[PDB]
Symmetry: C3
Subunit: 290 residues, 3 copies
């Protein structure tokens, strides 16, 4: 007890997943404030796991007002070594269809006003200046776990660099992808959606950043599964994103999301992470510029 | 019945549109509006006028209380908001003296309060995710364009008309705006990049005003006033405040004409269904419910 | 005459540019500066030094009080600010050990106090919309470039020289920076997009320092340093070159008359006051 342990952050359409029988419910505080909700601990098989809804169980907290620092820190505090996160998103690409999933490997950040670092010279932060490399922002091993889990659960995986497009059979998990994270709470204009598309981005979401950055700052291995619920608004009027559209597609996909997450947890449990964890901690220390 | 709010930007902080009924100070749950409001009538149509920046222009674009301004107009019972925004052209065919009835934007503002809803005490309870694919009221945009036609001002529609048929000064029937935070103008580097993205104009005051109007269930449309070519051309043509004001002055008369004709045209129609649909859109965007 | 302020970024957290003469710990209407300002002379030219990040580099780019730093310099009587910035390259021709006298930027910062003027209780009353088409002081840029030449450092200008003249290490005579908020570095995706926009370098501290300098009626120019043990040593060498360039630059500034330019800097601030219409 207790390394390794998997934190799971649930977004839209995934506010109150019943992933396992609750063992403990933790009301915690962090040096950066309260988490979105109480943290629920238990087991998937023999693997310690902790579940946390990003927006509160009642989804009363908008993406821009989520205390990403407290959520990640609380997970760290409870002994998590990994975080798996879900993120509802819209597709900016023809090959990414509602019902698909994307194991993101890249992002472009257009958020603001969100506390995005544990470190600084304000009293509300830890002392120091952390300049973390983010060139490939996710934990690669954990990404591959998510993909291998999809395969273990007989869900199609599409890998651009190894398969031709005819092998892109829906619904499928895309083995790579880039996300633009917008601040919200409004969805994009068509003008924004076309610009994002022209930039080469795969999907658009509101919740990926700064969660992914803070996980790394926290010395944790993080990976996102993005649930494609819509085509944003670059296609026809009938295909223009709204809350109803996002929710309806998510409820159709939740079963697969649950399956991937539970299998991913087991697979993380079947491996040693001593060196990777050590390298996570080390990357943090080497990143100190103070 | 219909009641039209008019929000006035740079070069239009004393619109003097009609002859005043009275001046009125209001309070909102989101703070004080930019100034008192002038209430009156255009013909038989109730109209309310609010300068965005205060009558002395002491409030910069990034510090304008757009929530309070928009909520104040809702609270006076406005069904529509017509806005003006001074802007720079990033394109050859949009020249100073022209107007643009915007249909799209790209948002580069930050630090502004851009929603009425949240989980903080200074906001309404709820998580509201408005669709914004086509962010204006289309009926109201078309009324602004018709108003221009009716006041014998040239209308240019790049969808039905060739570039050689562009006669200035003209109202462009569509256009997209990048809204920057201010208060500084753009670098040449920034202007070239916005231009490369395919944006038509640059301004500082469209967003979040347009988004809040939709959140408030109001029909909103903007007329952009081209006062300069930003800074993508030669040095003599690089935007500064004096250039902005000098051109805005020359264009104001046309701006006034369109707005007043627009107010009349809105009042001549029934908006019962549109208003219901406006209200329903808000309700359907509540994810917390 | 003139007085040259120097804002030292990474590598210049605690410089020894001249014999310390005066020490000034000030308080501005916009808060405290990053650290004490150090007074002195380069030859006959009055000079002031201030480390952007503070002596311990405790202060992250996004929490630097740029307003206080610039205002403090203005208050001490500075007419010029020369600034250094450590940066990453986005283009093949810009390599570690190179330098760039910037002439352009694209701003991606947010959350920073970026203007002296506004309606908030602690801003200067007024609305200021400064032109920023060419946001540096051009005479001052050319002084930096000349300073590089006077210290025998290669100068490369892609607009007037063949690629063959790009001999490293070199001062690139023009260049554009994207200024990101930090403190994290860019993802590959972000860098790809910035590069595709045509940006030359990426940094975290240029904006709003350059904007504020202009609002203050000061002449500002920036010398960027393009940046394991061989990288550290290279950066140590870069700092030595920049130190030399700035010293020569202060001398070169003091040798010229700046009456009209200073006047015109001041007139640009007044003509940008929209509230004074
Ligand atoms: N199109 C979209 N943009 C942003 N966040 C989203 N979440 C789901 N769909 C989205
Ligand atoms: N070029 C410009 N940029 C931003 N706001 C403006 N308002 C008028 N011209 C402008």
């Amino acid at each position: 007890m207790s390394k390794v342990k998997v934190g799971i952050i649930g977004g839209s359409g995934f506010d109150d997943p019943n992933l396992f029988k609750k063992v403990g419910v933790r009301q915690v505080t962090t040096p950066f404030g309260k988490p979105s909700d109480t943290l629920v601990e238990g087991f998937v098989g023999d693997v310690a796991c902790v579940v946390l809804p990003r927006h509160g169980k009642g989804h009363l907290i908008p993406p821009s007002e989520v205390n990403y620092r407290a959520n990640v820190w609380a997970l760290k505090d409870l002994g998590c070594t990994h975080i798996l996160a879900t993120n509802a998103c819209g597709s900016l690409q023809e090959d990414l269809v509602p019902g698909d999933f994307v194991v993101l490997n890249q992002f472009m950040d257009k958020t603001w006003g969100r506390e995005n670092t544990f470190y600084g010279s304000k009293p509300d932060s830890l002392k120091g200046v952390l300049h973390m490399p983010m060139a490939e922002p996710f934990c690669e091993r954990t990404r591959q776990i998510l993909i291998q889990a999809a395969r273990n659960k007989s869900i199609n995986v599409y890998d651009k660099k190894t398969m031709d497009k005819s092998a892109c059979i829906h619904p499928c998990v895309h083995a790579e992808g880039s996300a633009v994270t917008i601040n919200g709470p409004r969805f994009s204009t068509r003008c924004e959606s076309f610009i994002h598309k022209a930039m080469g981005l795969d999907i658009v979401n509101m919740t990926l950043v700064p969660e992914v950055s803070l996980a790394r700052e926290a010395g944790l291995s993080y990976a996102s599964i993005a649930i494609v619920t819509d085509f944003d608004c670059w296609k026809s009027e009938e295909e223009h994103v709204c809350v109803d559209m996002v929710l309806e597609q998510f409820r159709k996909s939740v079963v697969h999301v649950r399956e991937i997450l539970l299998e991913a947890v087991a697979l993380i449990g079947a491996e040693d992470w001593t060196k990777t964890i050590e390298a996570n901690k080390a990357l943090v220390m080497s990143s100190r510029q103070d």
